[PDB]
Every structure is written in structure tokens, then in C-alpha cells.
Write a protein that binds this ligand. Structure first.
Ligand SMILES: [Zn+2]
Ligand SMILES: [Zn+2]
Ligand SMILES: [Zn+2]
Ligand SMILES: [Zn+2]
Lengths: 70, 70
DNA sequence: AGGGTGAGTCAGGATG
DNA sequence: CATCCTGACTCACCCT
């Protein structure tokens, strides 16, 4: 069972998609919050257990593309 | 520790009252749907883990008497 | 990051 | 067969 966003240990199927606890709370905070997410690279960053902190923009984009939805 | 409605092991404070999980959802289904239950005894049926299924009418009365409420 | 509680779903048993 | 009632499982939100 791996998080379809960051490949960390999946806890269940949250907001329609198999994901870990951190990606669950990240996504909800991203949808509802006011954030200024901008990628410092090419909108194609590697998202894994460590790197996921680096680019919220690409993390959020991957959540959306994997089909996450409130 | 014990459900105030059927004396089974309580799982938490549900709808205002210390109850087991099954009495929790029993009550929720009784207050939203119809609760036109008939007791086949004398309205004092024994409600315990083994017998709580026999008399929804007496089970529902014990939920109300214990103070359960949405 | 995790406990507490509400709510949806599913399957199984009893019933018709 | 189908329908109804039950309770365990899973996930939601809220607060710490
Ligand atoms: Zn993740
Ligand atoms: Zn990026
Ligand atoms: Zn109970
Ligand atoms: Zn009764």
C-alpha cells in the first residue's frame, strides 16, 4: 500500500485516492487555504517522502491529477 | 466502560451518552426513520448484548431514558 | 499526528 | 429469490 502522490506508506483511500496521512491533510489545507504555490523548477518535480516538502505546487498538482477531491 | 443501554462494552460518548457502537447506530436509525415499534412483552424487555435485538421498542426507550439525542 | 465522534457502506442473518 | 434489521469497517471533520 503506497501513497499514489508521494509513495510513502498509504493509510487508506482519502478524498477518493490511496494516500498517506500527510498528503491527506496537505490536500485539504491546499484546497481550502489561501496559498501562493509556485514551482522553482519546471512544474515536474519529484514528489517523495522527503522531497514533497520542497514543492507544494507540484505536490498539489499531483494530488489533483491522481483524482483527489473534497 | 459499559454501554448505558445494553451493558456491552462502551466505545465512547455517542449522542450525549456512554454507549457501544451498535446502540449508537441503532438510535440514529430510530430517530430519523420511523420508530413505530411494538413491544411483544410488557415494555420492560431485558436489553443486554444477547437480547438487544429482540425488542427495538424497549431498546429505543432505554436510549431515550439514558438521554440520547441528536 | 492522533484521538474522539459522526456518518456511509457492506455483508450476513432472520424473515417472508 | 427479495426485503429488513444489525453491527463491523472505513473515512469524514474537529480539536489537541
Ligand atoms: Zn503521500
Ligand atoms: Zn515543482
Ligand atoms: Zn449498547
Ligand atoms: Zn419490549
Amino acid at each position: 500500500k503506497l501513497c499514489l502522490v508521494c509513495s510513502d506508506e498509504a493509510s487508506g483511500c482519502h478524498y477518493g485516492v490511496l494516500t498517506c496521512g500527510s498528503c491527506k491533510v496537505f490536500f485539504k489545507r491546499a484546497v481550502e487555504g489561501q496559498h501562493n504555490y509556485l514551482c522553482a523548477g519546471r512544474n515536474d518535480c519529484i514528489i517523495d517522502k522527503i522531497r514533497r516538502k520542497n514543492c507544494p505546487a507540484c505536490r498539489y498538482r499531483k494530488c489533483l491529477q491522481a483524482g483527489m477531491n473534497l
